[model samples]
Target chain A: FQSMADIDFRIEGHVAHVRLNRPQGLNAITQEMDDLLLDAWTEVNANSDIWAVVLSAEGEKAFCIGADVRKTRMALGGGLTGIGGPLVTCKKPMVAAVQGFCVGGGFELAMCADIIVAADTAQFGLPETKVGIIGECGVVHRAMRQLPYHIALQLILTGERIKADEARHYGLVNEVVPFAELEEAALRWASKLNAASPLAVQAAKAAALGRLGHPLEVALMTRFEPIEEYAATEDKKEGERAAGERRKPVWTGK
Target chain B: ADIDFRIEGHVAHVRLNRPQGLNAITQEMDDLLLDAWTEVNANSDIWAVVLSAEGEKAFCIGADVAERKTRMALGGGLTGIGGPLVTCKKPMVAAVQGFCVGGGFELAMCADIIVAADTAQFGLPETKVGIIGECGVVHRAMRQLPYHIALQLILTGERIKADEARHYGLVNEVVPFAELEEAALRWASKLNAASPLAVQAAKAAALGRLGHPLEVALMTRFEPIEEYAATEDKKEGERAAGERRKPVWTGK
Candidate 1:
């Protein structure tokens, strides 16, 4: 009940749906919502039943316009307060359902996710330079990984916005759908992941993303911890058994 | 000479002159390239570089296999002209055509911007030759491409066309073979129009960003940018913007 104010968090079967409830504020993150989000990520990680996460905001006009800049400035007495970097550190497979204005820090949130399903009407940007500080909350570094260096720098330096189609062309967004179909498309993607082995999925996610900073040789040699756990999962055995039997595998998420 | 090095105003022009071998790097070329890159970094007049290969046959096909075998027998390592860990101060624009494979592909990637001919073929064929892309190409490709796509290219040793490469964000521009050199020069000239110090500083910051934590990267004082920001050029940039005129930069 405490997590029901500025944000909504619920688990239905295998999916964790975390929605920003401040539609009036363009789903902008308040201090309250930020705290709730940290809790929600923790809950998703701790609960094994939740195999995938669908991070969406409850609004037609915006997925999230980032932080409440006015409120943040009033509270902090200068400098834009950002939603701390919990999204990047999460282990679960996160799919962001972005719509309308996903600007500034909100764009960073979409970047932080493993996969992005954006509405065709969505616009993404980092306007931090226009506001004095940098887009320091992973946008500067993460954008390079997600886009071409010059293109990323052009956005960072100019504070220019890109539409959803352009974002998709850059391979930043996994899918771009109509605004009306955003939630349904997001859930569809979530269902596909939910149907797979949760253990293997998380392990693959960890291994792929964890190797970002490691050198090729070090990454090749490094024993991924999640992979070790995945090797022992009952689902792993079921997967092998299903392949041999030529039948569909039912994952128990064991 | 395997390398043709010259300077035209603020831009340094370097070409792979050995089209007979598809610009495959030889030991002689490797040593020359080091000096070329060093000179590009050292010269204050050289604000940017346009790196192209002679002929329409190939931009570069990587290491010369025959020379590699000879060096291998003697247990000698390559001098590595492929631009792995290239630390030049100036920005580089690569004009690619034909086969840009293996070490050649790495060299193109090292440049800040790549202008590929529509017929250019890009690949990492080291896996097929029973060797890894030892020139830091794996990580470089990973940084430039999607994770799975980079892995696919590396693991399979497959080739992608210029259009496909451009579609995947690996190439900045793709044009006709006849337009490759002009395209690269145009990009270099575009970079030349900006404040040289600002462009170089931005280049340094962008390169420095890789492998750094978000918090650390932001807080990190880039020495070049810091020093440049304190100069007369910095003031001139602001002044010229207010005056609504092109700032005649003296590279101060």
Candidate 2:
């Protein structure tokens, strides 16, 4: 029905799945797909109906090769801006469930996610240093924030591939599953998060990540705003209510 | 010629010995420090670590810039703070004296507490050389101090005096050079006086929960697991409150 061959968007239950559809090219992003993604992110974030969102590649090879660089190379494309993009403003909780090579822009997508779940075979790095450029699109910024300085520099400066097992040592990735169970395991994690108060989840993610690049005292002082947001959620009330009722939460989604 | 090791009661005193060079750490010194960390990590009897340096001039001038230059020329893949490098896992304290710059600064960053001599100076001057700390200074400093201060320090590569370090939460205390050793032991004694498991758990909780969403960490991971629930500290806390008596802590 849609003309965009790059990516597809869908909402199922409490989860929004944004699937990169260009399996042949490992779901690279074009201008059309960037618009589609912005649309998806805006709609999903606006709609409190969805508790969590997942970004995955449709192909068996890579989750996303990143940025539709070929289109940019030809100057005929829409692409996410370097370093800071609109996704930077997105406050919703996102989970990137990657199964293959997550390079360049693909790494940026994973960085934007609140939780990154890559398959054991999934390869990650910013090859920008070798390409006569720097990691602009949040790869350098977020990776350093998420990982140790040494680990971040190792990937950023030289663009070496780090496997999932080694990536876990940085203590940022929520979980790394075997490829066979990657989707199921990622979904399971999302489901548990979905069961939480969406507002609380988003607020907590925002509060924690917001301070990443900032200074220590600023991080500490600025975090209280998000915690306040969590307290404001109706879902938080439901959380308390569910706990009081001694049963699993029946999320109101509000 | 590069590093020196000394032992005192219940503590291992490690000193960066190159006074003329302001105790610049070399590859050999780094390896020796790593080996010592391994000893501390594995040994049950060593209750505390005191990291100090000889000469009145410097604690650690910084990492060996010459060594880094060599590693770079060799195309060595060294990134990340703790990748087969000197990553300390045990409870240790740093006795800072004179210039604590660059990797010297990183060495102190690894410590749980820093006791600085009144003459000490601490700063990461890496950015000036077109290299970043790529170390725990930015990460750990943010965890320990105020934001504007850390941002200014890391970004500007400026040095601060000992009193300012204390004011910024960079050092736990600043004492006279004569009192630095005593101050280190005093803090160590206080730590040693606590229940060992409680101290360890407190350290883990502090470090693990740093930069995390505190409400979540407290509710989920820190809810006192079954083993902790069974500890004397818990009972002591409860019993003290219940009986209205000051329960003596035995540091079990």
Candidate 3:
């Protein structure tokens, strides 16, 4: 819909919405489509004017059916190769508003995000193992890190679509709204997150992302890095001033 | 604190006997309880273990609250060199009949199964007392429940009644006071009937894997699994499973 990227990217107010637009066949991923997605997400991350990004699908019936089985198999037949992309390198806070078929690669996309806002009817799973294949696309790798260990394996090994509320129980989704309220609720979170100082937001992201693969004690101390940086920022000083003056701080996101 | 011991059928019942201060675990009692666990584990005569207290109310307000005020470490928790059967090899079950809070709750969690009476309550109240339950209770509950829910329980330092904990899948069973001993014995017998080797391995496996990643733990299973696979019980299990025969097991 916009340029060569199959992903339709645009900014609405402060929230940037990235829609996986191939709705007719449920947005099954192809090699070209993966490249397109990588590029579009790169554009969004690099745009300083954009505050937050919401990745959703175009229609009500499907979020993303995940890696195009036919195309993936075809590509593998010719010897599978890896393509580096910006979606994996996303620097800002990314949120996903999910509905319908979120499986395999689609689920991977959502997992890569910082928060997930799912519709009550949304379906989540990694249906890869059922067909005698493996999800080498970071699905199996990051699965246990996302949930309690045995519970995560129960889903990955069985490859069953857990319901919306169950997803929340696993901490996979932040909030699950009724289908009618999904968009509004997701946008509200995006807007609220956007209103926070960019320093705090980016610092939070850095603290969380930076601590992975480190020891617990080391990670615990590293979280204070953000607080030190915030103390040096004008936004933080203004926040302190507002509290002292008994008024809300107007965050310029400096 | 006197060391109290009893026998409820196949279960050897042990109670932390300092009840005036709500069965606060004195150092002497901790030693006695540890010895009790060792005795029960070695004795083939006793099939299971049930840990409870002497009173009709307040099973334990927990590990000598006054002792906590004095014996804490520089960092605000007691990190003793030994555990009260923290490494017990046998299958232990807890019959939590009343206010099992603080160190009392920590002791209960070390057991393999928890059978709480309807009136029993469980929680870590150390943080409120200017101390910490860093002695595995704060760490272990998170391993059992969902992350956020576990944080809410530990961070708030509140007591969860047996019924509510059961709702969260923490309590294995809840029973009436009169039936409590009977229920505990039945569960003990059930565990006793299984191959002791397998049960021990499983219990150790469950505890050792806390806060550990799956892949790292899979590797730890190699030696124990191989050793278990070589047992007569293993072959018996397979043959019984294949022929549909009832297999009587030896401790081996």
Candidate 4:
């Protein structure tokens, strides 16, 4: 109740589980929900207890159809609330468990994650073309880099859906599993991240993401603030302690 | 049709036609290829490109192996990994099969997507002949392939099989011979459905800042990307989407 119920934010051990609760609405996003999403990821970054995030939705029918276009267009314009609800900037590792139709802004949101576990029933697309609106979402830029060029353009231009199997082969969806085990897969991935030194995991994610577009030589030469912060953490020292002592060492994120 | 140039629909097809010679690019082919690359980039009507060859035996063996320009500038320093063709702001698909090596390998690497037939074999033979000075093969390979793996292939002067190339993601698809050309054209035609300007903009933004840091890349103003905002197609695309209708883009 502390956080709006529409965005379900809960802590299960060291993993933060965030679910879009408006399943009846096919988990479509509302502006109010964007603010809540922004707060959730912000807190996830700030809080030491949450080491990783598993972002999923409550519906069996849809992970999210994107912003409720009908409700949204009646009121105004959109850049998604990608800015206000920008989980893309979070330094922590995030996993998205998507099922059913995940389109447009919802597709963009899933792309924000480091790893995506899609249920076999999941279908993904950028239907913004069908609506004739584009260039703003910048999902094209991300898609072009994530998927092979022609495939990315095919999806971007045609606004056609691709199944989870195809998406997995293209490297966009990290794994595809049965729908019943979708959340389980995401939670398990999040837990694995939680099991590691949080600082190291977060730092790795931050470093890799920050360096994504850069060429390898330039990316390697670049300095990441997260890596610096991680190096300063007690977890950094605990890495050596655990390895030499030959047992898994406990990490205090700090 | 010098070097086999043709345009159908929104797709442009450019082929390495000297198949009997194993598609060893001669000075004549180079000149024609330059023209093809220029036309593809300059013509707004040509949205997607297919770069391939005519024969089943070889896609390309890299510049006339008999006379590989040893003066091939460092990093192609004067040019780039592939050539002027590598800089296309539009999408490209390279259909490769058989002996794709040396300069041919570099050319294939220039493409945005590559599909190879089961018979394709890829390698950089520059090392085998004791010549690495001007060839940008190693540098390009290092960028496209994993570091250690890239070194292993270059250092050994060994050829990689179609299946092996797929494993490393050097080529996205490995098809049967008949399906190879169709696959490339199919990919190009699929891209024709998008706003050509938007697609070019996306390509430019991706390629232009490829050497910069994340912050630098994000902040840099990609001319094409910025120019796209004011395009008539941008407005039409929005209105059509809002109106729930098909957008007729003029590439304006």
Candidate 5:
């Protein structure tokens, strides 16, 4: 409810920047920060002005090293749900601007985003197996869904780290940029997504993720509510009108 | 027999035998394939499988349209060859040669490991023929390949060569046409050497949890692995590891 101390929430243009601000802790999430992140995403979902989100971190050394293992183990007893809850389920398209170490839960956090723009030197891994905890979040499922089965299984079993280039090559990452340009690259992506019809974008994401749970026949037959909502929007009509007029459509987030 | 089925030690070799017809699947072949898969699924001796065709010109051109027209009406019910959905109880290594199209491509994707000849081509020409790819090919394609790429193939009926398929992670290994069988055999042997119980369990887990939620999948009890835990091979694996020697699995 109140302003979170370890997290930074701000809006630049139409993109909401939900940043992990605990640099001294390598941006490792405390329970409080995660709860705040949920709140931040909820705010983004409600606000019509915000069309897209860019999940960033404040440190040069690491975007996020994952959950504060020691703190969560001691204070929270190692079970945390609210941390990864919002990002994956959010309505708007989200982009991750990753830098330095993005490991364990941090890597899952990036994977939660629709697009990832990682710094060239960034390292990604899931050491959950090494630490004897399962990657309970959608990391395993999402990774397998996004990457090749063998590649996904290898990472899941070995707990190995892959650099940005390898991740990009595997199609897990959208783009790899210099550390200095990481934020800019992510913002650019956010801007591009924001320029599109928000209604259509969110609906597309909803159908894409929603249909994964069903078989192909069922998926084709499924009716998505978001797309229905988009059909009723002024922007949808505007899109067609603009296309016929040979100009870019003006999106009102309607 | 339209399909040649033979057992070589621990591996089952399933070869499509109508090379003169480009290995185009006929009614006889479908029934024979089902029998082969059913046998392999039940037989405890077979640890792995190598799926290949007779000629380098084409592995299979998909369903024999000429035969189908003669035997079935326009709206004939779909049929199953090999088990439904092309699933096998053991790991299947597909050694693909040229023109793996439509149902043929579906069968290749069904394999746990696919070894493609460099000259091999893959496609789903169903859309062009005014039908959709049944037998889980459309679903498997999206699950195995990139979304947009899969859409391109499904929608356009476009063909992709082995290298491109490998680049997109659809094909596991791509070798020269001459070495296709060797590569597939090597993969089959590798799988054959692993604990059969363990390998089968892993394959079951991966395939069964395809569209499951992460939470559900993590908790999903893989019956195969659970059964594997009770096998002598499980204990033997531990014993071999502790003794610093290679495992001698009995597949018991």
Candidate 6:
């Protein structure tokens, strides 16, 4: 695990960091990076000690420019197709620290995250059509949903970019920070989620995500497994008990 | 046509013509709206749409309740909201002023962007009027507004002004009634800045997979998005940007 290259996996208290390390090459995802990312996501979900994650990259410039076109077929894009041909949504909450050019699949990776923290230098776009390689990478689906139809279409069709402030105005990114403060800003988002009852946070994320595209009638009747699991968790009991005792709750993340 | 529909450049302007009755959607107007949807979606010339109503008094009150007893067994349906029989593929901006109530408010929600006049008042009095047939508004309002606020409007049949609606993010912008047309047209005009085919692709992609599970939605291939890739505009757009000029769209 310590010997993994191109993608760094590290732990700091309850927050896990999955950093793209090939900054000189704009952190383009290679086969090695893809394997490392899968390992990182699996470890984050498997380890109870990790409550949240900050998906980020190392560099002053590009966060990632999608897959290394020279090395691979751009199949994984930004190493996003780890599980299926794309990826599984992180079981726990995730925040992305995005800076510089996050184009094509790299932009798709950010959209996959629950919360996004962008640097002032963050520029997001989809240049698939421009490159003459149209793949159903699912970014268009995510972009059209996350952003206004016209704005999203402009980015997709024109291969034009939106700056961090513009993205935040459109609610594409949760927050925007100075380039130097990007990591801490993202970590702050992860920390708050980590502070909460991990099971409940995850359950809420699950329920909210599950509720989309469902009619109100159907959504109210829907039963999400994560919500059910949260109800049976020890943290659920501790939360109630702590409420009764007028004390701060200690969440074991069970 | 019970409504005024005109094409101006890349924008399609649709205004409710029945100003005397607060621009309510009568039985006859429903058919017109259905045709409007087909025309806007089918016509490549339409890149963006502006939906508004004539006169200063009201945008639309709701479906014409006077004709409802003979028209429907109960009340309300998808027609009550926005009145588009086919899901609109073009980006729409609704310029709402004065009494936008019941189905009218629901109709506004259907638009991708809503710009309300300062005089606009939005409401759903189905509960008070005892005409609650379908939960269409309830379904959309809950998703669009705060749960309590949407419930408050549904149960109490209350009305909220433009400022309040704008505060809650229900309307994208709130402008003076005098400036409503310019503001709405301005928003619609921005949509034309993008590739028309690409814009339609975005709308189709959004609504196509919107209701499905993320995994299932991700797996599905929307033809518009895929088809849009082969359009001449896509290639021209890139070339135009490289040469620092605006690309002319054929909408292929």
DockQ of each: 0.01, 0.02, 0.01, 0.02, 0.02, 0.02
Mark the regions of model 1 whose C-alpha exceeds 4 Å error after superposition.
Answer: A1-4, A70-88, A135-138, B1-252
Error of 1 at A140 (Å): 1.2
Q: Once superposed on the true structure, which residue ranges of model 5 sit more than 4 Å away at CA?
A: A1-3, A70-88, A135-139, B1-252
Query: Each candidate's fnat, in order?
Result: 0.00, 0.00, 0.00, 0.00, 0.00, 0.00
Indicate the worst ten consecutive residues by lDDT in candidate 1 chain B: B70-79
Fill in the DockQ of model 3.
0.01
Model 3 residue runs over 4 Å out of place are A1-5, A70-87, A135-138, A223-231, B1-252
Look at candidate 2 and tell me the lDDT of residue B249. 56
lDDT of 3 by residue, B140-248 (tens): 6677667887777677788888888889878889998777777777778888788766877787676665556664454344334457888988888998989998887
For candidate 6, list the clashing residue pairs, or say none. Answer: A81-A86, A213-B211, B82-B107
lDDT of 4 by residue, B24-129 (tens): 8776677677678788889888888888898889998876634445323211211364432236778988999998888788878888889999999999878888
Give the TM-score of candidate 2 (chain A). 0.85
Per-model TM-score of chain B = 0.90, 0.78, 0.80, 0.90, 0.91, 0.89
TM-score of chain B of 5: 0.91
Better candidate by TM-score, 1 or 3: 1
Poorest 10 consecutive residues of model 3 chain B by lDDT?
B73-82
Cα deviation in Å at residue A13, candidate 2? 0.8
lDDT, residue A223, model 2: 31
Question: Candidate 2: lDDT over CA atoms?
Answer: 0.70
- Give residue A74's error in model 5 in angstroms: 16
Q: Comparing 2 and 6 by DockQ, which wins? A: 2
lDDT (10s digit) by residue, model 3, range A1-254:
34355667788866788777778768776666666666666666677667688877878887887766633333210111122221245656778899987887677777777889999889888787876676345456566788788878977898988888998987889999988888788888888888787668877887776668766654553424555668888899898999999987887656
Tell me the lDDT of model 4 at B85.
27
Clashes per candidate (backbone, < 3 Å): 0, 9, 1, 4, 0, 3
